[PDB]
């Protein structure tokens, strides 16, 4: 026993006094969205959707790691992760204020509503946006006063995204789709 | 050639007036007749030591006999042979009844799976393995367990006569 102590006989043994519970599942989301918000108070969060080393655990049986884990006891198949966090949830709405410049999401996912935001002039040259033959964007300009000739809806929810349609369209510095709740349980003993 | 035999051979490399009593070399070789046996022994001696048939003698030949022909035996075999691109060094094992039948099966197996005619094979050793849990290959490790119950279905059988009324079956 040389390296295993640094995980079992070190971290868990020095923090075998936790009674919090934050069970989350990354089914299909931008991983860093949940990761940075689990962090920010960095150094107290690490995903550990584990593996099957419980035969060895029972061989060395003297853990008593989480007695509050008796709820999904017939779920020995892709179990949730033994992650240790004891953070508060009354911090984001008072301590941190006026961020407003975070990074957008993957840029490409499906939006909830069909919205066309009005574009303001900036004084730049046209870029590499000569790929729109399929559906396109019929528009007309007349010194700022823009006029759309026909509307197009591209896709609904429940379908994967294209490849080269996220270059110079969303130039407002807005995250297109984070806006959701993904969590299995949030308890304290 | 025919069904194999095998002999022990002893040569001497005839003496000299200044250096009498040579060292007396022995080998044991597999063949079909005493003549080709001694010829192939001389061939191996040519290859492995400096001596010539015009400068030697065969001091003894003996057609040995295997001891216990009743006991089925597990024989490991080492061989070095040449092929259409290069040479190799192979090792196998066979469950058989005697060493002559072992080598007879080995030559057919090599001619099957490597096209190694008799003119390109020479055996290094054939030894016995006596205990269990020492075989290696899963085409001979089967028949060691207890109770080898199995049929061999589809019992075909020919007919000396050319015609037949009953339209036979193949039960067994």
């Amino acid at each position: 026993r040389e390296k295993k102590a640094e995980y079992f006989a070190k971290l868990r043994e020095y923090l075998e006094e936790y009674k919090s519970l934050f069970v989350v599942g990354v089914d299909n989301v931008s991983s860093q969205q949940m990761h940075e918000v689990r962090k920010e108070l960095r150094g107290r969060a690490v995903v550990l959707m584990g593996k099957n080393t419980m035969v060895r655990r029972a061989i060395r049986g003297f853990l008593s790691d989480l007695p509050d884990f008796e709820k999904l006891l017939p779920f020995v198949k892709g179990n949730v992760g033994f992650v240790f966090t004891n953070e508060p949830l009354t911090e984001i709405k008072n301590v941190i204020v006026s961020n407003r410049v975070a990074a957008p999401a993957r840029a490409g996912a499906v939006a909830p509503e069909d919205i066309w935001v009005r574009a303001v002039n900036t004084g730049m040259e046209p870029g590499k946006t000569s790929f729109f033959q399929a559906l396109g964007v019929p528009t007309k300009i007349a010194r700022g006063t823009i006029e759309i000739v026909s509307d197009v809806k591209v896709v609904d929810a429940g379908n994967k995204v294209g490849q080269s349609e996220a270059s110079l369209l969303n130039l407002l510095n807005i995250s297109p789709f984070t806006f959701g709740l993904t969590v299995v349980q949030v308890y304290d003993n | 050639m025919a069904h194999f035999k095998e002999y022990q051979v002893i040569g001497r490399r005839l003496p000299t007036e200044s250096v009498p009593e040579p060292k007396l070399f022995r080998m044991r070789i597999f063949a079909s007749n005493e003549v080709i046996a001694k010829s192939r022994y001389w061939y191996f001696l040519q290859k492995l030591h400096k001596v010539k048939k015009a400068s030697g003698e065969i001091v003894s030949i003996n057609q040995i006999n295997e001891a216990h022909p009743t006991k089925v035996k597990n024989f490991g075999v080492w061989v070095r042979y040449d092929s259409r691109s290069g040479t190799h060094n192979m090792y196998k094992e066979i469950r058989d009844v005697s060493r002559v039948a072992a080598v007879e099966t080995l030559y057919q197996d090599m001619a099957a799976r490597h096209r190694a005619r008799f003119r390109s094979i020479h055996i290094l050793k054939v030894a016995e393995i006596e205990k269990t849990a020492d075989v290696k290959r899963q085409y001979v490790k089967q028949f060691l367990t207890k109770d080898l119950k199995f049929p061999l279905p589809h019992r075909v059988q020919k007919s000396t006569k050319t015609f037949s009324y009953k339209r036979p079956s193949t039960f067994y």
Binding site: - | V72, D96, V140, K149, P151
Partner: protein
Amino acid sequence: TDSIVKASNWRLVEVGRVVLIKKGQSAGKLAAIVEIIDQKKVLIDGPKAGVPRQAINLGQVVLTPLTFALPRGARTATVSKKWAAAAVCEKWAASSWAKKIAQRERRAALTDFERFQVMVLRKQKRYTVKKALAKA
């Protein structure tokens, strides 16, 4: 409400099953399988029948449905004693195969006078059978 399967039971090769040969030096003498090498080659024994101990290919041998308990790797002194103890000949000759063999042998061996006897007796049997079959 049953899960029926027929039988799927055919005759096997196994230490103890007496066998019969068809072509070779001995030619038609029972023998007892004692050991097994691989799919084709084994060694058999039949000392009371007078065959030596040797190895024969299974294609050269015919099987039988009789058998009895044997230990592996035995030899003549044991297999002959077990053969005599089981007394296979008490039931083999009683079986409906050696009787047909003896029938073949006698029918091939008998001569002209016996043939004429069999002819007249076959006329007798035909008469007797057809008598009872005609009326009823």
